């Protein structure tokens with residue numbers, strides 16, 4: 001499915017951090033573009049750890065999911081580099097990075113309208129996936145990328161894209177899934193094979209909580225055992241201090257998966273504010 005990119009056409013530059021069994025770099029791809037123009041394009045290079053090569057299928061299936069459909073709110077995958085012993089996903093480089101970092105850095109100048117616009121865009125991307133019956137499986141603020149900053153001077157809203165989910169929770173070790181509470185929904189802690197469209201509605205709620213909490217991580221003070229007991233006791237997240245979306249967050253984070261609202265209903269709710 002994926003376009004194969006030669007290792008020789010890729011330059012690896014600085015490490016940007018780590019994902020689950022991955023290391024992430026900024027790089028450059030040399031390519032021929034439209035009209036035969038030569039380009040040296042900034043790219044995100046996502047590299048599967050050699051020690052976890054056994055996850056390669058799920059590693060690439062994540063990307064393949066995103067590239068099944070084309071949409072203005074979904075990250076572009078340029079291709080893969082599987083030369084030699086490396087498993088590399090090549091993705092569009094998104095200048096302003098992921099939303100959790102951006103929210104933490106830019107608290108003082110992010111207001112409720114900015115959060116509402118971003119929430120609406122994420123809901124639009126999820127409605128598109130839901131209409132296509134395509135599960136994402138790892139909606140969270142780290143996987144939302146800021147393409148364009150809000151410019152109140154020209155009325156331009158911010159613009160985000162949803163990035164790929166990474167290796168699926170259906171294959172990850174149990175301890176990692178538990179560390180990912182409360183993004184991973186309770187039914188998936190009970191049985192990771194319970195991954196379903198309803199999964200994304202729960203994680204969407206958790207992500208809205210991040211958006212409203214300046215990039216804080218919900219339940220970060222709880223170790224894994226306490227996160228588990230949080231689900232066992234059927235707790236909900238505290239309302240963010242900016243609590244405008246708190247009812248929507250809790251409605252999405254419904255312990256009954258069948259009761260979680262459709263993304264059309266979610267969008268209708270967002271539009272009402």
Ligand SMILES: NC(=O)c1cnc(N[C@@H]2CCCC[C@@H]2N)nc1Nc1cccc(-n2nccn2)c1
Pocket residue numbers: 016017018019024044091092093094095096097098101142145163
């Ligand atoms: N498609 C992308 O461009 C992209 C995708 N994912 C991520 N995730 C980042 C890196 C890996 C760990 C998690 C962290 N949120 N960052 C991206 N771009 C980016 C752009 C500017 C700066 C940085 N940056 N500088 C220091 C750290 N991150 C990253």
